[PDB]
Design a protein around this ligand. Structure first.
Ligand SMILES: CCCCCCCC/C=C/CCCCCCCCCCCCCC(=O)N[C@@H](CO[C@@H]1O[C@H](CO)[C@H](O)[C@H](OS(=O)(=O)O)[C@H]1O)[C@H](O)/C=C/CCCCCCCCCCCCC
Ligand SMILES: *[C@@H]1O[C@H](CO)[C@@H](O)[C@H](O)[C@H]1NC(C)=O
Lengths: 98, 268
């Protein structure tokens, strides 16, 4: 059967405006392994995105890490969008900072 | 401190024309090898990925895997036409060993179907009837059953032993965590959710708990261990608190890399 991907967005370092940081997008619990992942700045697709090799847990569900360099500001927004066959519409999760 | 070697294979078949096979190897929590479908070579990710194995011992395994990948793809397409199984096909393979037992597990459509036990393939306890027909064909292949038995009991244990010694410096490494606080609005009115982020720590074990004085807050919710790109871990512990009862709250972090020195972060 198909499994819905869970999405988690988090930064590598303490978020500070004007300071370069790393944004992570961790997608888990999905099947089939065919999946499309995009990280967004202000709604636009970030070109410089690297992804680790896709792997699977003990239970045969897949997981994969996406990350990119980003400099957070007051007005900028960041999100990770995922397209999978288990969902009719793409799922978007925003980066929550304060 | 156990460091098992997990050899993972992800083979997908959309149609009779399209197919991919990607692989990788885990030693504990560190990825040691990367096997891209587009490459004829299993790529090493670390200076000690070969271990004790010489370059000549390594190329032997290199050609074996190259043959296996082409042969695996052929056999699955053959088993599809034979067992009357419809595309798409999803196969996953989990093999390897740990030096002090070995294992070979394959999965069809996210479910276990068979494993390699002793000297032959056996179907799983929960497995469809057509699996038994596939086992009968697989078990007729005497050369494959001897090669797998030779890799799991002969090649693998000597290889893992070579990895643990050649990479003991990186496997036993200690990275110090860095913590910070934040607060998102809670679902209930008059409540707020405090978040204590902990990132950059290694190895995996870590202790995070919200505190008042010396009293541990049992309302603390520990999250999952999320990976970073630099082979370090991320973790956050949340706590729902009422408005006006946020004062006196602190997040305490304990890790082996700190050497008995706690990380304390009082709120506001
Ligand atoms: C630890 C060292 C490595 C560390 C670094 C790892 C690098 C990272 C990579 C990770 C990926 C690891 C995942 C893969 C596991 C490792 C490989 C282990 C298996 C090696 C198998 C070697 C043997 C092999 O390739 N056999 C292949 C060639 O066999 C030979 O073919 C010949 C014709 O070309 C002849 O027929 C011959 O028989 S004869 O009698 O007629 O002469 C026969 O023995 C054979 O095709 C392979 C079979 C593998 C089957 C495994 C699948 C298990 C059951 C799954 C069935 C699914 C069917 C479902 C269909 C919907
Ligand atoms: C994956 O590699 C195999 C090996 O030749 C190749 O046949 C296949 O076309 C590759 N898959 C894709 C999608 O290019």
């Amino acid at each position: 059967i198909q499994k819905t991907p869970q999405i988690q967005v988090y930064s590598r370092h303490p978020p500070e405006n004007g300071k370069p940081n790393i944004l992570n997008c961790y997608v888990t619990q999905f099947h089939p392994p065919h999946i499309e992942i995009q990280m967004l700045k202000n709604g636009k697709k970030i070109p410089k995105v690297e992804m680790s090799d896709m792997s699977f847990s003990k239970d045969w569900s897949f997981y994969i890490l996406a990350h990119t360099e980003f400099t957070p500001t007051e007005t900028d927004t960041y999100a990770c969008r995922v397209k999978h066959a288990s969902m009719a519409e793409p799922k978007t999760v925003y980066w929550d900072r304060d | 401190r156990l460091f098992p070697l997990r050899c993972l294979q992800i083979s997908s078949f959309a149609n009779s024309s399209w197919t991919r096979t990607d692989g990788l190897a885990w030693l504990g929590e560190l990825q040691t090898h990367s096997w891209s479908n587009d490459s004829d070579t299993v790529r090493s990710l670390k200076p000690w990925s070969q271990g004790t194995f010489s370059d000549q011992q390594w190329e032997t395994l290199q050609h074996i895997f190259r043959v296996y990948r082409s042969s695996f793809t052929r056999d699955v397409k053959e088993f599809a036409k034979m067992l009357r199984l419809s595309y798409p096909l999803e196969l996953q393979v989990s093999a390897g060993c740990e030096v002090h037992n070995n294992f070979f597990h394959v999965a069809f459509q996210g479910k276990d179907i068979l494993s390699f036990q002793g000297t032959s393939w056996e179907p799983t306890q929960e497995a469809p009837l057509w699996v038994n027909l596939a086992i009968q064909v697989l078990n007729q292949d005497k050369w494959t059953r001897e090669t797998v038995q030779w890799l799991l009991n002969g090649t693998c244990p000597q290889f893992v032993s070579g990895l643990l010694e050649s990479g003991k410096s990186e496997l036993k490494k200690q990275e110090k965590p860095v913590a910070w606080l934040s607060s998102v609005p809670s679902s209930a009115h008059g409540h707020r959710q405090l978040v204590c982020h902990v990132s950059g720590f290694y190895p995996k074990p870590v202790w995070v708990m919200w505190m008042r004085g010396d009293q541990e807050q049992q309302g603390t919710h520990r999250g999952d261990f999320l990976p970073n790109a630099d082979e370090t871990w991320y973790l956050q512990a949340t706590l729902d608190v009422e408005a006006g009862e946020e004062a006196g709250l602190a997040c305490r972090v304990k890790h082996s890399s700190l050497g008995g020195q706690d990380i304390i972060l009082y709120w506001s």
